[PDB]
């Protein structure tokens, strides 16, 4: 762990987010700012053409022009969907595009709003003496009013910090692997499972923070992208950079490096034949930054844990392992009942394909356990 | 150099491959072996319907279960396209599948025929002390007689190689990027470029071996796979392993370890993006050796050769950069050139989406110049 970008106390988030561009894009930061009225009031799209063409260069260091990405990726998100009720936009300003592009091709990133950049990049402590806890700190951007994004973002922030408790422990088991110490191995990998439970807390304890009206509400359209869209059948012209519409996939939380991260570790099996479930999440790692989803392929360039404990014969282990894949299915479970206290309840007077996708992936999970129960 | 299984002489290619398997598998190597004869009179499909299930016990040592990984990769590729003409296989027997998934799963590569089994484990010396040239080498298998198998193969695997002589100067790149030693680097990379003329100059001069109406031979057909082939809608079913129907690609040249390592090293990032074509040369990943793929991301995870010489306004080192460049262009533009001169003009007395495909990898590649101002 050196340049994986992987800190030690916030994990794959973003750590202490640049929250003030340079006044040189001033006129960028206001539309972002303000995405909630300009966009109920309808005056977004024109105070988007209203910009003119500014260059990304004064966006030195890697913090700057990864806020930017984040001020970009809303308006962009705000610009495509409008007040998200149909009213779509297939081409994109080249007044907002170009840099949108250049800085998005300069991070390796595709031009669209991700969880990268809208969760990890997202978010600041009020004060700053005080730790880490949902009322210490708050988002930088939202979309409309009361789409309770605030607490949407800040909540899986929370719990991705909560698992990097976990991340600290990896190469303690990889070397422990390979010099042969049962015991550090097993205490470590008790030790994963421990931060993986911490994890269910932090979104046990901090789910009152999301209104039952939050799918049907206006989130989810402003996080929706053009691959595969209707809306967007072939995808967004972004406007002098790329002579064709270029489709990209939207938001997922599959973009989240922490549960790929130890769905690899633990051998879990998201790769199997593919499947729309292995198979999307894999090539959701093209939307992770780039020293993430490097990080997460050097795992796999690591042997085995699940075929290092299988063949030990070890009854300590097995439990030490499956105490940490149980702990999966605990926080992909809590995670579903949440999730279906939010679908089939604002099907009120698509939607199930996503139900499917959850299911199989914990599915996946749970079929990976040694003692069945 | 180390854990990735790069030969010094023959780079990615397995260094000795085996010709003959156990005498367990006799069951095997027969069909395999005699499998033009098969097809034509159409017993094949008959034949391993009536097989034996050999467990994958008997087959050890590493050049021995990758001839077995390529003996039940063609069998299963005569199995599915039979004839070439229309009939087609959806299901694999249980005595079939099962043992090569057992082994795959084992190997970690996924369960279809893939480049580095037909090609890189895939050849011989008819003179075993005499150098690595074509008349010297004979393939180990093909489909149908005359279907244009050795030539194709063999000159994959000859510019394969030729190449290669360019992977053992890769840590050099790396040492003087590190030491900070500009000479060495400058030099370093001069040779990385020759390598890489010298292995354009093996394509020139043995590019006729490679049978002139080769893409229209079965050839194709037997290298076709299930992942968005219309013909195996939802993919070829593996039972007694996965009950439902699984999906893996049929051979691409873009699971070639080298040209994609080259792409990485000179930082074409031909794998960043999102877009298409950059979503599957990173998904090729997953069909090359795991010991390869690892060594690939290793590149990944160290510092860009590119932002490096872009950094220091050092013209020379500009120069000798850009001829690496060229070098992988020039490689490009010619494999171009024979594709254009063997698909494009036979077809009229995808065939786009395959010409389009090359180009963009070619452009990107031409895009990673420097000295352009
Ligand atoms: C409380 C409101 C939440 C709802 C309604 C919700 C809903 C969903 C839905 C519908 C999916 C599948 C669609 C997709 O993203 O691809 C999903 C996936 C996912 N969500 Fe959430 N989610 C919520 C909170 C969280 C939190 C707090 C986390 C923790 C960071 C999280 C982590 C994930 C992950 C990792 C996936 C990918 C599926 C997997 O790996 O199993 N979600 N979520
Ligand atoms: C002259 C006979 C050949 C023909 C007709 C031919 C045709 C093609 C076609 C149609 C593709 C795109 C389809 C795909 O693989 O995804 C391709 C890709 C590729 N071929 Fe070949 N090929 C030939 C010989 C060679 C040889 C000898 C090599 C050297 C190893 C080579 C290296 C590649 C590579 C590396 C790719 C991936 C795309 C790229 O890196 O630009 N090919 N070839
Ligand atoms: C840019 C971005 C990416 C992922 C997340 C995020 C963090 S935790 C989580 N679970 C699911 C998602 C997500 O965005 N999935 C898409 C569908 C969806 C989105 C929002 C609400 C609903 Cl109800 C459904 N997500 C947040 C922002
Ligand atoms: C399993 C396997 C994979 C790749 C190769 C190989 C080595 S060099 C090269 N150029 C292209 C390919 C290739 O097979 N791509 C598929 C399209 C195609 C192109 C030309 C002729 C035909 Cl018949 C098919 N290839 C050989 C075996």
Redesign the interface.
Known sequence: SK?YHIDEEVGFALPNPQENLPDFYNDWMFIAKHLPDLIESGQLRERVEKLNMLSIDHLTDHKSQRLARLVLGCITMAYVWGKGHGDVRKVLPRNIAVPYCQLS?KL?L?PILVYADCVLANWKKKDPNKPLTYENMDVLFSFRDGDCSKGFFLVSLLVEIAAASAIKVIPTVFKAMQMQERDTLLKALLEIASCLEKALQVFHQIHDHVNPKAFFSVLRIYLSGWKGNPQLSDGLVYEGFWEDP?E??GGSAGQSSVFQCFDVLLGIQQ?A???HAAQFL??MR??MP?AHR?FL??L??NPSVREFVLSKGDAGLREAYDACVKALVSLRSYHLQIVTKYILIPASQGGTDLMNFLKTVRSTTEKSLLKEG
Chains 1, 2 share one sequence.
């Open positions: 340049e091709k390796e595709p270029k990209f996939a790769t034949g593919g499947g894999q090539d093209r939307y780039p490097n392929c050097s796999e360039s």
